[PDB]
Amino acid sequence: QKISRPGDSDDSRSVNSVLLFTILNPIYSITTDVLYTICNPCGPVQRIVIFRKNGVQAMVEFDSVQSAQRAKASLNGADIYSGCCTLKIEYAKPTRLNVFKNDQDTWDYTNPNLSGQG
Angle between helical axes of 65-75 and 32-39 (0-180°, round to 10):
100
CB-based contacts of 98: which residues, under 8 Å, 6+ apart?
47
Three-state DSSP class for residue 91: strand
Q: How was this structure determined?
A: NMR
Closest CA to 91 of 7, 13, 11: 13
Helix, strand, coil percentages for the chain (3-state, nearest 5) = 20, 25, 55
Q: How many CB atoms lie within 10 A of CB 11?
A: 9
Determine the Cα–Cα distance for residues 88 and 36; give it in Å rounded to an integer: 16
Domain layout of the chain by residue ranges:
12-118
Q: Domain 12-118, what fold?
A: Alpha-Beta Plaits (3.30.70)
